[PDB]
Amino acid sequence: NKMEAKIDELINNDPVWSSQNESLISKPYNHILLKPGKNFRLNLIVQINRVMNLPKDQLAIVSQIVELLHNSSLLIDDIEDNAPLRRGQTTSHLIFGVPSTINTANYMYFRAMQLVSQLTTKEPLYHNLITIFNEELINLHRGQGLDIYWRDFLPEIIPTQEMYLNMVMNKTGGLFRLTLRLMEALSPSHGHSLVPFINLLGIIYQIRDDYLNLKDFQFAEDITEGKLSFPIVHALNFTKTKGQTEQHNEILRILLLRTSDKDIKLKLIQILEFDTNSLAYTKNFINQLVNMIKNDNENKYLPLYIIDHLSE
Amino acid sequence: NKMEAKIDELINNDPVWSSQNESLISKPYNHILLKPGKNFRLNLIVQINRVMNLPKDQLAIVSQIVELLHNSSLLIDDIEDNAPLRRGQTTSHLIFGVPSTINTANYMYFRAMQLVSQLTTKEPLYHNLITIFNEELINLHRGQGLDIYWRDFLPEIIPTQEMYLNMVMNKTGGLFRLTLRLMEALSPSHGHSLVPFINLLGIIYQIRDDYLNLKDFQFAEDITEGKLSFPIVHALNFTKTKGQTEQHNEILRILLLRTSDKDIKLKLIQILEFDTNSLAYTKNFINQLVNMIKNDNENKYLPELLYIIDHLSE
Numbered sequence: 001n002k003m004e005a006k007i008d009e010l011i012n013n014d015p016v017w018s019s020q021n022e023s024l025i026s027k028p029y030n031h032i033l034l035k036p037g038k039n040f041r042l043n044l045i046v047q048i049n050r051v052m053n054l055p056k057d058q059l060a061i062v063s064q065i066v067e068l069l070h071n072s073s074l075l076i077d078d079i080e081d082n083a084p085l086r087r088g089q090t091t092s093h094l095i096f097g098v099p100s101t102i103n104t105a106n107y108m109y110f111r112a113m114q115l116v117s118q119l120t121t122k123e124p125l126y127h128n129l130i131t132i133f134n135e136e137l138i139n140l141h142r143g144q145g146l147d148i149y150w151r152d153f154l155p156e157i158i159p160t161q162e163m164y165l166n167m168v169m170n171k172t173g174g175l176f177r178l179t180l181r182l183m184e185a186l187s188p189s190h191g192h193s194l195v196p197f198i199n200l201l202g203i204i205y206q207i208r209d210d211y212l213n214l215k216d217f218q219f220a221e222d223i224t225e226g227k228l229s230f231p232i233v234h235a236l237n238f239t240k241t242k243g244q245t246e247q248h249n250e251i252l253r254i255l256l257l258r259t260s261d262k263d264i265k266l267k268l269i270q271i272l273e274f275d276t277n278s279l280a281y282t283k284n285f286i287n288q289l290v291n292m293i294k295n296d297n298e299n300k301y302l303p304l305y306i307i308d309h310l311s312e
Numbered sequence: 313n314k315m316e317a318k319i320d321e322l323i324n325n326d327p328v329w330s331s332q333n334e335s336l337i338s339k340p341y342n343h344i345l346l347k348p349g350k351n352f353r354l355n356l357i358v359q360i361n362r363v364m365n366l367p368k369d370q371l372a373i374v375s376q377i378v379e380l381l382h383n384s385s386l387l388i389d390d391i392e393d394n395a396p397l398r399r400g401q402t403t404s405h406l407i408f409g410v411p412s413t414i415n416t417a418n419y420m421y422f423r424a425m426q427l428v429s430q431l432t433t434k435e436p437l438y439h440n441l442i443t444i445f446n447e448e449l450i451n452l453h454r455g456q457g458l459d460i461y462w463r464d465f466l467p468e469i470i471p472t473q474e475m476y477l478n479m480v481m482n483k484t485g486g487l488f489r490l491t492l493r494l495m496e497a498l499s500p501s502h503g504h505s506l507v508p509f510i511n512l513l514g515i516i517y518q519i520r521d522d523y524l525n526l527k528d529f530q531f532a533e534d535i536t537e538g539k540l541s542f543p544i545v546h547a548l549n550f551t552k553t554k555g556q557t558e559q560h561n562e563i564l565r566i567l568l569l570r571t572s573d574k575d576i577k578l579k580l581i582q583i584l585e586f587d588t589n590s591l592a593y594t595k596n597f598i599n600q601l602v603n604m605i606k607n608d609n610e611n612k613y614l615p616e617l618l619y620i621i622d623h624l625s626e
């Protein structure tokens with residue numbers, strides 16, 4: 001009687017979800033929102049909108065979509081990379097646990113997917129925005145997948161610089177392209193697509209990220225992670241090309257230690273500085289990429305300041 | 313200059329991805345594919361199609377979408393639940409690592425999303441299909457979120473039976489409704505919606521999953537997990553209501569040990585058998601839910617099915 005009646009009412013209604021339940025699942029996400037950098041991504045979307053011209057509130061939704069995807073991808077990335085810190089603050093999984101952090105990050109990817117339907121009610125356009133969203137999230141995961149595979153199967157595969165760049169086009173290029181492609185699709189206005197420029201921005205951003213992780217130290221957490229970062233990939237291929245067997249193996253040994261020992265981390269930085277000159281090689285490489293934009297007098301890529309502060 | 317030429321070529325082309333790359337990152341997923349269950353899920357989809365009549369090619373895609381979703385959900389649930397085994401086999405994260413397993417499962421959620429486009433060439437219907445897919449994946453994550461939070465922050469929140477059933481309507485009900493709603497949306501045909509029946513199947517499935525995890529032991533891994541299972545929720549509320557302070561606290565202590573000790577697990581199960589009578593309560597609750605369908609002569613919930621209902625665990 002009463003039990004069957006309560007069951008019948010339950011199965012005939014939509015699943016129950018409260019604002020309190022929403023606050024509970026949002027805790028790991030709210031924690032990363034404390035991290036700085038929002039001002040900066042906001043600025044890049046604003047500046048690109050000088051070309052695209054989306055109306056303010058449509059731009060607001062693109063921005064929210066991008067923020068959810070970026071933050072969620074970093075919450076998961078930190079679990080994948082066993083990262084203890086992100087922008088100087090403790091990572092969410094060390095506070096709320098890996099289980100809630102993964103579930104919340106995933107939930108926010110689906111909340112971002114839902115916000116796409118609010119960019120437009122035109123069916124054909126909507127289909128195109130969801131396809132952009134789906135394609136670039138697929139690319140991001142393919143790229144992350146390779147980054148993780150090389151790291152976790154090392155020394156099975158040592159990537160070449162070309163392989164690394166293709167991984168970055170997928171991994172870091174994904175959200176850069178997603179944000180821009182959504183904006184170019186919604187533009188009510190503009191010229192050649194800016195996807196090439198934004199691919200270049202993504203490459204520069206990732207090589208700089210990998211470089212600064214080591215250069216600031218010289219926490220160099222990337223060494224503890226065992227990551228096949230741009231300078232590491234240069235150093236492994238360089239020692240291999242030169243027949244520098246012992247040095248090649250010592251770089252591999254230190255990466256495989258997954259060490260937090262400052263003195264050992266410093267020894268790998270010494271190899272990269274004195275033996276392969278990989279940090280200077282990387283500095284020069286980022287400069288060359290940046291100059292491709294600085295000297296784009298014919299605006300083949302462009303439609304300064306952002307590019308220089310790209311790391312934040 | 314050759315550097316510029318190469319960078320220019322790279323940024324002017326789609327990102328490079330090979331079939332070898334695809335194979336290497338699919339490892340965690342290929343491994344769970346070795347587990348049984350596929351035939352059973354295909355059987356429930358087949359029976360419901362006797363009502364929905366989708367053409368075979370189209371039913372095949374629905375089935376592929378749901379399978380990718382189901383499998384990716386389990387890869388991730390096992391990481392969340394620190395599970396060593398799934399269907400008698402070692403779980404993927406123990407073999408390939410949590411990093412690859414999480415990324416591959418999430419990749420497969422997006423591959424499933426991609427497959428929705430192959431169900432129709434009509435934009436208005438497509439939007440509906442994507443909405444269904446999005447809504448039920450949101451529900452699944454909301455339910456999973458409560459299940460995890462209650463367990464990992466215990467005793468912050470002791471859920472009631474009512475709370476547990478709402479978490480299940482979200483968690484377990486999510487994929488059952490996703491499959492059924494995609495089918496009802498694509499039907500070219502068929503009576504009242506089967507959503508209420510599918511919600512009941514989800515609840516029966518989950519409470520039976522919880523019950524059997526303890527009754528086949530009586531490896532009771534749910535105790536090691538610390539899960540707020542249907543019998544554990546009944547025991548915790550029964551003890552509080554009855555003033556069994558020590559037993560209420562002992563249930564919490566055992567759940568918090570995250571123990572693999574078989575005798576500590578058996579002590580808890582026997583507290584549920586004899587002190588709170590949670591096992592009998594759960595068996596009876598399951599039977600009552602199943603009878604709501606077996607005694608549905610007017611076909612108010614119902615549109616073979618009964619066979620699936622008794623083998624729902626598979």
Ligand SMILES: CC(C)=CCC/C(C)=C/CC/C(C)=C/CC/C(C)=C/COP(=O)(O)OP(=O)(O)O
Nearest residue numbers: 041044045048066070073077172175176179180
């Ligand atoms: C293009 C426009 C208009 C705006 C940009 C909008 C966004 C979201 C920019 C940021 C995109 C971004 C930085 C994506 C990469 C996120 C990712 C997958 C990180 C994980 O890779 P790691 O190499 O582990 O990164 P960390 O070094 O931070 O741990």
Ligand SMILES: CC(C)=CCC/C(C)=C/CC/C(C)=C/CC/C(C)=C/COP(=O)(O)OP(=O)(O)O
Nearest residue numbers: 353356357360382385389484487488491492521
């Ligand atoms: C409705 C039709 C036609 C078919 C059904 C098709 C499917 C996919 C059925 C199964 C759906 C199902 C059982 C989903 C639950 C997946 C999930 C979120 C599991 C995680 O929860 P736990 O409670 O940890 O489960 P375990 O006990 O298996 O670890």
Ligand SMILES: [Mg+2]
Nearest residue numbers: 077078081083
């Ligand atoms: Mg990282």
Ligand SMILES: [Mg+2]
Nearest residue numbers: 077080081147
């Ligand atoms: Mg990473």
Ligand SMILES: [Mg+2]
Nearest residue numbers: 389390393395
């Ligand atoms: Mg589980």
Ligand SMILES: [Mg+2]
Nearest residue numbers: 389392393459
């Ligand atoms: Mg679970």
